[PDB]
């Protein structure tokens, strides 16, 4: 039977019941003990209501807004008897305002993204710098400094951001042994950054390849994806964004830094979902990825930053997304940007519609003695159906990572505001690994200069294959 | 009751039996009168032989090379009793050499491309400018100057290059009439160029959208297309090319002109199949197109050039391909360029495999008073199966254009070396129209500046939306 990790003796408030909420709720009932009536789901859509009613769970058909979130949520969070848990899996809501609301009411909190109130993503008056995830992330870092410690609030604990942070630590451990780097396993942020520096890790790709396919072809004028379309399109239209490593010798003309913050990121003045990079995964081998902005791009580079006594950074890795979505999403991207506007409709591929395919999601560490090393999951839809209901392979990697964040938080309920990089990676993977299918590490001799230059003059840097000048596609 | 247009009183030698050869052979048998034993096919492929054997057609399994084409084609084309016809529908053969050989022995000739001998396209010792279709077309133009007149030989008479030259003439006449400009239509090149100048036609997209899809999904590591894969990938890896209009005020930094020749073209130092442009078709609306180099991009711009007394160009339209192939081909291109290498296998979708779709292929005249006007064919696969065998919608548009060009050559056998721009377009479209499905003209108020600028800074020219500055994706 499945392990029941803890009893939750308080209200469980799930904000948003979309593709990820539908997959997470079954996992919460499976691995936690509690009275079913103590759970409550909040979502404005009629489709979510009918699903919630099919589960016999309390439902409030309401959109959480800046105007109503205090009056709406505080009664739900303080209903008792004990400590409540706010599980935020929504769009169009401010992760920071809800997070702060839960903390000051003594309720645990978890989400999978730093989401802003509706209007932010397309606000015409915001500068590209303020539209970046770097800026959104700095609002959570500022909150953590203004109110250190307290009730635990786990920020950005999905598959990516989230799971991949744990994969980076396990990958670093594996690389140390394989490169025969002597030493004791790191137990602090400073020790981890120092290990990556000592291993010669110049950068990291969040290298992903989704091969799931449906029984019907991509409909015309319909955006298709295996997870949130609204969320993917929104982040796809934000600036391309990456953690900027100290080994880089070149950035493009339309790249910009930040005047304040942790200083670990840059951004390009162009949408990320229409920005290609050269990357690599085990199933796909050499492929194009899209440089979509993610929280872990900034948080991983910042976490693995080494500073001198003066506070200046002397080592940090490059880190960014390299996303090859399912073929219907690639076509949807080609369609959307080719038209200049969102499609008239969208849909998320369901477990009942997907014929085959996997979601290969891992971290690719490069620049070290063995060139490149990819570590991550290869979960298949066949395995997904066999172990978890109401979700495809993309959704299970995410929902299982929310399960591990919830377990860690109940076991560490007074750790303050934390990101996935602050969680005990070994305990989190122990919870999640049953839902990840094969988890493997693989070396490769491939580099972004393979087969280059070709028959056209090209702006490459042959001294160092992994320079961003060689990765970025023009 | 199919019309039989002409008797062919000599040998019919068809070089190549791929997708286009298979679709063209039934049309030759259908529309021309000749003794069955006069037609012979030459193709080195084993798959081709078995097909031809099943049609009861003579087949010589041999590659036409530089070291054998004289001793092979001369006897075959001069077998008598009178004039033969060389139908060249192959890859890796020299169109020019075979064409000059046919003319030297009084045989008519037609092809759909200026193809070089094997080894030319990927030769590392060639500058990009030498690998341009502009350079190839100049060899044909020079051959015409060195031997004016003589036996007719039709260069590049397929769907595009070929049929789209006739669409431009019809579109120009339609635009005039829609403006209330009656009167005698042009009958010389000078008058045609003047008409385009007088109507304010700033440029022309060969605007195409293929919607044919297969009963199976895109297989991994396979390049899929509705026509020649080897032919498509070769031109896709050639530099991007376009006829360069006199109204253009900007070109990229990696754009180059030519020192010699007609002087109508530029090229970019990047592969066309990885270069995107903003265009439009009736069924697709606003879409991305690929800037694949094509012969008609130059010949149309050249044909519609107006010069002053000194010989300098005072008007010329911009002209280039804006190709949106089928979805599997879009995926194939993403896969080929993302990995940096041709796939291990390829296949051309057969009519038995295609489940639905059309080949929407026409010309988009822009810059005039009515903004933009699309004229062309919307042939569907369903109508294709009802009227012609052994081909899909893409192939039928090509084979029927070859049919049209053969009719014109047989009717005008002493015209010398000619391009599709030099043919009687009303007679050619009279022959081809039964195989083009809906042939319609559509006006649109769309421009490349639709919805721009976005949330990012952009280098655009708001005074003239159709400037290549705004069309080219950057
Ligand atoms: N880190 C990761 O790995 C990861 C992976 C997938 C999704 N996500 C994120 O998780 C979130 C949920 O993803 P999903 O696939 O379920 O998205 P989805 O679009 O399928 O679901 C969104 C749900 O939120 C609801 N909603 C919209 N506005 C709301 C409001 N104002 N208040 C309350 N609810 C509202 C909708 O009714 C819908 O049911 C997204 O924001 C996405 O960015 C993260
Ligand atoms: N203008 C147009 O509208 C248009 C459209 C499609 C294709 N084309 C052109 O038509 C040509 C044929 O197209 P397809 O779809 O039939 O291509 P295909 O790849 O389906 O067929 C090519 C054939 O040429 C044969 N071949 C290869 N080397 C040869 C040699 N040395 N001698 C004789 N035969 C040889 C192959 O065996 C093959 O059967 C291509 O060159 C392509 O560029 C033009």
Numbering used by the authors:
A (entry chain A), B (entry chain B): 3 to 476
Publication excerpt:
Bacterial HSS is mostly found in α-proteobacteria and in some β- and γ-proteobacteria, including pathogenic strains such as Legionella pneumophila, Brucella spp. and various P. aeruginosa strains, including PA7 and PA14. Bacterial HSS is NAD+-dependent, active at neutral to basic pH with an optimum at pH ∼8.8, and shows increased activity in the presence of 50 mM potassium ion. BvHSS forms a dimer, with each subunit containing a boot-shaped substrate-binding pocket between an NAD(P)-binding Rossmann-like domain and an HSS-like domain.
The W229E variant was generated to scrutinize the possible stabilization of positively charged reaction components by a salt bridge instead of a cation–π interaction. Apart from the exchanged residues, all residues in the binding pockets of these variants superimpose almost perfectly onto the wild-type residues without considerable deviations. Regarding the structure of the inactive variant W229E, the location of the carboxyl group of Glu229 is probably not completely fixed. The carboxyl group is rotated between the two subunits of the variant and the omit maps reveal a lack of electron density clearly supporting the location of the carboxyl group. A reduced occupancy of the carboxyl group at a defined location due to flexibility of the side chain or radiation damage affecting the carboxyl group should therefore be assumed. In any case, the side chain of Glu229 is able to protrude into the active site, as modeled in the variant structure, which would sterically interfere with substrate binding. In conclusion, the inactivity of both variants W229E and W229K is not necessarily caused by their inability to provide cation–π interaction but might rather result from steric issues or an enlarged space enabling increased flexibility of the substrate.
